[PDB]
Coordinates of all heavy atoms in Angstrom, one line a residue:
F1 N 37.6 50.3 -88.9 CA 36.5 50.7 -88.1 C 36.6 52.2 -87.7 O 35.7 53.0 -87.9 CB 36.4 49.9 -86.9 CG 35.3 50.3 -85.9 CD1 34.0 50.0 -86.1 CD2 35.7 50.9 -84.7 CE1 33.0 50.4 -85.2 CE2 34.7 51.3 -83.8 CZ 33.4 51.0 -84.1
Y2 N 37.8 52.6 -87.3 CA 38.0 54.1 -87.0 C 37.8 54.9 -88.2 O 37.2 56.0 -88.1 CB 39.5 54.3 -86.6 CG 39.9 53.5 -85.3 CD1 41.2 53.0 -85.2 CD2 39.0 53.2 -84.3 CE1 41.6 52.3 -84.1 CE2 39.4 52.5 -83.2 CZ 40.7 52.0 -83.1 OH 41.1 51.3 -82.0
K3 N 38.2 54.5 -89.4 CA 38.0 55.2 -90.6 C 36.5 55.4 -90.9 O 36.1 56.5 -91.4 CB 38.7 54.6 -91.8 CG 40.2 54.7 -91.8 CD 40.7 54.6 -93.2 CE 42.3 54.6 -93.3 NZ 42.8 53.7 -92.2
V4 N 35.7 54.3 -90.7 CA 34.3 54.5 -91.0 C 33.7 55.6 -90.0 O 32.9 56.4 -90.5 CB 33.6 53.1 -90.7 CG1 32.1 53.3 -90.6 CG2 33.9 52.2 -91.9
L5 N 34.1 55.5 -88.8 CA 33.6 56.5 -87.8 C 34.0 57.9 -88.2 O 33.2 58.9 -88.1 CB 34.0 56.2 -86.4 CG 33.4 54.9 -85.8 CD1 33.7 54.8 -84.3 CD2 31.9 55.0 -86.0
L6 N 35.2 58.1 -88.6 CA 35.7 59.4 -89.1 C 35.0 59.8 -90.4 O 34.6 61.0 -90.5 CB 37.2 59.4 -89.3 CG 38.0 59.3 -88.0 CD1 39.4 58.9 -88.2 CD2 38.0 60.7 -87.2
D7 N 34.7 58.9 -91.3 CA 34.0 59.2 -92.5 C 32.5 59.6 -92.2 O 32.0 60.5 -92.8 CB 34.0 58.0 -93.4 CG 33.4 58.4 -94.8 OD1 33.8 59.4 -95.4 OD2 32.5 57.6 -95.2
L8 N 31.9 58.9 -91.2 CA 30.5 59.3 -90.8 C 30.5 60.7 -90.2 O 29.5 61.4 -90.5 CB 30.0 58.2 -89.8 CG 29.7 56.9 -90.4 CD1 29.1 56.0 -89.2 CD2 28.7 56.9 -91.5
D9 N 31.5 61.0 -89.4 CA 31.6 62.4 -88.9 C 30.4 62.9 -88.3 O 29.9 64.0 -88.5 CB 32.1 63.3 -90.1 CG 32.5 64.7 -89.6 OD1 32.9 64.9 -88.5 OD2 32.4 65.6 -90.5
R10 N 29.8 62.1 -87.4 CA 28.6 62.5 -86.7 C 28.5 61.8 -85.3 O 29.1 60.7 -85.2 CB 27.3 62.2 -87.5 CG 27.2 60.7 -87.8 CD 26.2 60.4 -88.9 NE 26.8 60.7 -90.2 CZ 26.2 60.5 -91.4 NH1 24.9 60.1 -91.4 NH2 26.8 60.7 -92.5
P11 N 27.8 62.3 -84.4 CA 27.7 61.7 -83.1 C 27.2 60.3 -83.2 O 26.3 60.0 -84.0 CB 26.8 62.6 -82.3 CG 27.0 63.9 -82.9 CD 27.2 63.7 -84.4
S12 N 27.7 59.4 -82.3 CA 27.3 58.0 -82.4 C 27.7 57.4 -81.0 O 28.4 58.0 -80.2 CB 28.1 57.3 -83.5 OG 29.5 57.3 -83.2
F13 N 27.3 56.1 -80.8 CA 27.7 55.4 -79.6 C 28.3 54.1 -80.1 O 27.8 53.5 -81.1 CB 26.5 55.0 -78.7 CG 25.7 56.2 -78.3 CD1 24.7 56.8 -79.1 CD2 26.0 56.8 -77.1 CE1 24.0 57.9 -78.7 CE2 25.3 57.9 -76.6 CZ 24.3 58.5 -77.5
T14 N 29.4 53.6 -79.4 CA 30.0 52.3 -79.7 C 29.9 51.5 -78.4 O 30.6 51.8 -77.4 CB 31.4 52.4 -80.1 OG1 31.5 53.3 -81.3 CG2 32.0 51.1 -80.5
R15 N 29.1 50.4 -78.4 CA 29.1 49.5 -77.3 C 30.3 48.5 -77.5 O 30.1 47.5 -78.3 CB 27.8 48.7 -77.2 CG 26.6 49.6 -77.0 CD 25.3 48.7 -76.8 NE 24.9 48.0 -78.0 CZ 24.3 46.8 -78.0 NH1 24.2 46.1 -76.9 NH2 23.9 46.3 -79.2
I16 N 31.4 48.7 -76.9 CA 32.6 48.0 -77.2 C 32.5 46.6 -76.5 O 32.5 46.5 -75.3 CB 33.9 48.7 -76.7 CG1 34.0 50.1 -77.4 CG2 35.1 47.8 -76.9 CD1 35.0 51.0 -76.7
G17 N 32.5 45.5 -77.3 CA 32.3 44.2 -76.7 C 31.1 44.1 -75.9 O 31.1 43.7 -74.7
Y18 N 30.0 44.5 -76.5 CA 28.7 44.5 -75.8 C 28.3 43.1 -75.2 O 28.7 42.1 -75.8 CB 27.6 44.9 -76.8 CG 27.4 44.0 -78.0 CD1 26.3 43.1 -78.1 CD2 28.2 44.2 -79.1 CE1 26.2 42.3 -79.2 CE2 28.1 43.4 -80.2 CZ 27.0 42.4 -80.3 OH 26.9 41.6 -81.4
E19 N 27.6 43.1 -74.1 CA 27.3 41.9 -73.3 C 28.6 41.2 -73.0 O 28.8 40.0 -73.2 CB 26.3 41.0 -74.1 CG 25.0 41.8 -74.2 CD 23.9 41.0 -74.9 OE1 24.2 40.0 -75.6 OE2 22.7 41.4 -74.8
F20 N 29.5 42.0 -72.3 CA 30.9 41.5 -72.2 C 31.0 40.3 -71.3 O 32.0 39.5 -71.5 CB 31.8 42.7 -71.6 CG 31.1 43.3 -70.4 CD1 31.2 42.7 -69.1 CD2 30.5 44.5 -70.5 CE1 30.6 43.3 -68.0 CE2 29.9 45.1 -69.4 CZ 29.9 44.5 -68.1
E21 N 30.1 40.1 -70.4 CA 30.2 39.0 -69.5 C 29.4 37.7 -69.8 O 29.4 36.7 -69.1 CB 29.8 39.4 -68.0 CG 28.3 39.4 -67.7 CD 27.6 40.7 -68.2 OE1 27.8 41.1 -69.3 OE2 26.8 41.2 -67.4
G22 N 28.7 37.7 -70.9 CA 27.9 36.6 -71.3 C 28.7 35.4 -71.8 O 29.8 35.7 -72.5
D23 N 28.4 34.2 -71.5 CA 29.2 33.1 -71.9 C 29.0 32.8 -73.4 O 29.9 32.1 -73.9 CB 28.9 31.9 -71.0 CG 27.4 31.4 -71.1 OD1 26.7 31.9 -72.0 OD2 27.0 30.6 -70.3
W24 N 28.0 33.3 -74.0 CA 27.9 33.2 -75.5 C 29.0 34.0 -76.2 O 29.4 33.7 -77.3 CB 26.6 33.7 -76.0 CG 26.2 35.0 -75.5 CD1 26.3 36.2 -76.2 CD2 25.5 35.4 -74.3 NE1 25.8 37.3 -75.5 CE2 25.3 36.8 -74.3 CE3 25.1 34.6 -73.2 CZ2 24.7 37.4 -73.2 CZ3 24.5 35.3 -72.1 CH2 24.3 36.7 -72.2
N25 N 29.6 35.0 -75.5 CA 30.7 35.7 -76.1 C 32.1 35.3 -75.6 O 33.0 35.4 -76.4 CB 30.6 37.2 -75.8 CG 29.5 37.9 -76.6 OD1 29.3 37.6 -77.7 ND2 28.8 38.8 -75.9
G26 N 32.2 34.7 -74.4 CA 33.4 34.2 -73.9 C 34.6 35.1 -73.9 O 35.7 34.7 -74.2
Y27 N 34.4 36.4 -73.5 CA 35.4 37.3 -73.3 C 36.1 37.1 -72.0 O 35.5 36.7 -71.0 CB 34.9 38.8 -73.4 CG 34.3 39.2 -74.7 CD1 33.2 40.1 -74.8 CD2 34.8 38.7 -75.9 CE1 32.7 40.5 -76.0 CE2 34.2 39.1 -77.2 CZ 33.2 40.0 -77.2 OH 32.6 40.4 -78.4
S28 N 37.4 37.4 -72.0 CA 38.2 37.3 -70.7 C 38.4 38.7 -70.1 O 38.7 39.6 -70.9 CB 39.5 36.6 -70.9 OG 39.3 35.3 -71.6
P29 N 38.3 38.8 -68.8 CA 38.3 40.2 -68.2 C 39.5 41.0 -68.6 O 39.4 42.2 -68.9 CB 38.3 39.9 -66.7 CG 37.4 38.6 -66.6 CD 37.8 37.8 -67.8
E30 N 40.7 40.4 -68.5 CA 41.9 41.2 -68.7 C 42.1 41.7 -70.1 O 42.5 42.8 -70.4 CB 43.2 40.5 -68.2 CG 43.2 40.4 -66.6 CD 43.1 41.8 -66.0 OE1 43.9 42.7 -66.4 OE2 42.2 42.0 -65.1
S31 N 41.8 40.8 -71.1 CA 41.9 41.1 -72.5 C 40.8 42.0 -72.9 O 40.9 42.9 -73.7 CB 42.0 39.9 -73.3 OG 41.1 38.9 -72.8

């Protein structure tokens, strides 16, 4: 993933773990 972003070499946004609190994703806060 980092390599793709470095290859693109242009401004962008990454929503890391988007919708972090939705139960459809089941993410845990500390991790």
